[PDB]
Ligand binder design. Structure first.
Ligand SMILES: Cc1cc2nc3c(=O)[nH]c(=O)nc-3n(C[C@H](O)[C@H](O)[C@H](O)COP(=O)(O)OP(=O)(O)OC[C@H]3O[C@@H](n4cnc5c(N)ncnc54)[C@H](O)[C@@H]3O)c2cc1C
Ligand SMILES: CCCCCCCCCCCCCCCCCC(=O)O
Ligand SMILES: CCCCCCCCCCCCCCCCCC(=O)O
Length: 571
């Protein structure tokens, strides 16, 4: 009905992080008709704009509310896996931390044309940074906004740095500078513009909505790619939920469908389109279009656990929870005034503004990320405690002052899968994160050694000054066996999720897309989102997705090629 009689050069499945970048770049010269189909609503919520309102976005109508299959290895629990559902996708609901990982993460992909030297200029092209000018590792002029965090905690932020130094960690002045080793303690930069969330709807899509050649439809749930050698024709979707008419957006000749539904929903939709392992498609009577073993395999997510400690009575009031709420759960006037005048103070924080990367055991690259939060978790599940914090408003109760360190296996060895639990394209996917399944027990060992490292930091004189014991995991949890059980019972997502449509070299049989991001076995179909990441980089995955989308757009528009290897000579 909104697509009746129209033909599109590009159809983007999803209106999230990658899709916003692509919609901007592919509509720029005016020559191409671009359609965006997003299942969620428009990006208008105040809870998206204010960073500290991330607490309110978990388990909300702006989230997919996805739960994993029962995980036998995690005390038989379903794990919540947050995912944004609106224009800007997870960039609209994330913690805003700006991380690229290390040069070695991209070299470890081993994919032709996607070395660290190849991807660096695409990170730089996306970027405008308030604290780093143009240089080898930073750009100025690109649509993203990055800045140093605008919340300062007078006592706890430098206490964390001093404690990390007391345990023998060195400072890292810029976690995105590839001329330094990745390990160390330091500030985490944020995807914010003077304390306002700088999501990719705000930075890339919203500014170009006036373009006549760009059509964005919200409340548009894609059901499958229409495929006719298999050739993408366009995409089926409903604007009225499960009961709605199935509409079809049609490609113009030479048009492509670009999958941008993310690492959960892209492999899910491909399987619904007949692209995936033939056994999984036959199970639900889906005709096999491209028998592609890797679709929904290689799910990589960074699992997390935490330690938390209360401050001494004399330091009551020094935590970010005290800067946001008063003793009755009322949002503090100082926080509101600082946010609106100046774009500073506790509402500019998603909780962590600094942390560390750490080698627990002599690895080539850090296996552990540490997020320092100058507030105390009341649950060993950090995501649960954020939901508690949002619900705490106006309850007439005092949130106890303290600190938290979240421990993340940032380069995990475990993998999971995404598949189908039914033939209905409106049903949730069959989601298995696979945390702690790697054969050596490396991910469990990382998080166990993480807890020991967080304990050493909390015991150090610089932080010890403020603290009065330990809440989580607490006094009862000391032996390796007690720590491992705490981790199995409390492990939660740090919200990465990559690799389910993995890019690979010619000859890599686990590949779903080639180095041109083309889906094997289908013409005119590409994936441009976190699905394609071959091996997860250390740190949060949003900046890498924008880099991939920026480079994909340049390839599609003819401004760049990927893979510059000299042809072997004629003999
Ligand atoms: C809670 C949370 C915290 C995070 N913290 C950080 C962090 O601090 N820093 C950072 O860099 N990264 C962070 N990340 C990760 C980062 O946000 C993601 O890796 C990145 O945004 C993914 O981009 P994408 O384009 O692959 O997918 P998304 O941005 O998730 O976009 C996919 C889009 O597809 C839509 N969609 C799904 N199915 C359909 C359908 N059938 N039809 C139509 N549309 C559909 C979704 O609604 C969504 O809008 C976080 C993630 C979350 C969820
Ligand atoms: C508990 C989690 C934090 C909640 C934050 C909500 C703040 C509500 C107080 C009133 C906000 C007034 C300022 C309005 C700003 C709206 C967003 C923006 O335009 O940047
Ligand atoms: C915005 C302020 C919130 C204050 C909450 C109190 C402190 C709790 C810290 C929880 C520790 C782990 C952090 C969980 C982070 C959830 C979001 C994310 O995954 O980045």
């Amino acid at each position: 009905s909104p697509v009746a009689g129209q033909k599109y050069d590009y159809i983007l499945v999803g209106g999230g992080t990658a899709a916003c970048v692509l919609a901007n770049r592919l509509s720029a010269d005016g020559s191409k008709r671009v359609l965006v189909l997003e299942a969620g609503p428009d990006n208008t919520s105040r809870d998206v704009k204010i960073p500290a309102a991330i607490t309110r976005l978990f388990r909300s109508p702006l989230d997919w509310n996805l739960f994993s299959e029962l995980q036998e290895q995690l005390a038989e629990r379903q794990i919540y896996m947050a995912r944004g559902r609106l224009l800007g996708g997870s960039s609209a609901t994330n913690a805003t931390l700006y991380h690229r990982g290390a040069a070695g993460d991209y070299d470890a992909w081993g994919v032709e044309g996607w070395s660290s030297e190849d991807v660096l200029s695409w990170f730089v092209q996306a970027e405008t940074n308030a604290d780093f000018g143009p240089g080898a590792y930073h750009g100025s002029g690109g649509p993203m906004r990055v800045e140093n965090p605008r919340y300062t905690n007078k006592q706890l932020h430098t206490a964390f740095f001093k404690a990390a130094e007391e345990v023998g960690l060195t400072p890292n002045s810029d976690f995105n500078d590839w001329s330094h080793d990745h390990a160390g303690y330091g500030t985490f930069q944020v995807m914010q513009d003077k304390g306002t969330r700088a999501d990719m709807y705000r930075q890339y899509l919203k500014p170009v909505l006036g373009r006549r050649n760009l059509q964005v439809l919200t409340g548009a749930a894609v059901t499958k790619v229409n495929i006719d050698k298999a050739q993408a024709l366009g995409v089926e979707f409903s604007t009225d939920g499960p009961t709605g008419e199935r509409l079809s957006a049609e490609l113009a000749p030479g048009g492509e469908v670009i999958m941008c539904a993310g690492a959960v929903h892209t492999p899910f939709l491909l399987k619904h389109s007949g692209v995936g392992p033939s056994a999984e498609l036959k199970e639900f009577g889906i005709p096999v279009v491209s028998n592609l073993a890797g679709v929904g395999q290689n799910l990589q997510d960074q699992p997390a656990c935490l330690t938390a400690a209360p401050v001494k009575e004399k330091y009551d009031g020094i935590a970010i929870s005290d800067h946001i709420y008063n003793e009755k759960g009322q949002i503090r006037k100082r926080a509101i005034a600082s946010y609106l005048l100046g774009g500073r103070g506790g509402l500019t924080s998603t909780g962590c503004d600094r942390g560390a990367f750490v080698r627990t055991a002599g690895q080539a690259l850090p296996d552990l990320q540490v997020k320092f939060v100058p507030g105390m978790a009341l649950d060993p599940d950090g995501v649960s405690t954020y939901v508690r914090f949002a619900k705490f408003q106006s309850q007439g109760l005092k949130w106890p002052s303290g600190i938290t360190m979240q421990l993340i296996a940032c380069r995990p060895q475990s993998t999971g899968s995404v598949g189908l639990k039914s033939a209905d394209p409106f049903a949730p996917p069959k989601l298995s994160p696979g945390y702690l399944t790697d054969k050596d027990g490396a991910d469990l060992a990382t998080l166990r050694k993480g807890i020991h490292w967080a304990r050493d930091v909390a015991r150090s004189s610089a932080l010890s000054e403020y603290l009065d014991g330990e809440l989580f995991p607490g006094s009862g949890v000391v032996s390796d066996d007690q720590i491992d059980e705490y981790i199995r019972r409390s492990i939660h997502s740090s919200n990465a999720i990559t690799g389910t449509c993995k890019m690979g070299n010619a000859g890599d049989s686990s590949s779903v897309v080639d180095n041109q991001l083309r889906v094997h076995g289908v013409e005119g179909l590409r994936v441009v989102d976190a699905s394609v990441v071959p091996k997860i980089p250390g740190g949060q995955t949003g900046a890498p997705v924008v880099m991939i989308a920026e480079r994909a757009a340049a390839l599609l528009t003819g401004k760049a090629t990927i893979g510059a290897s000299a042809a072997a000579p004629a003999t």
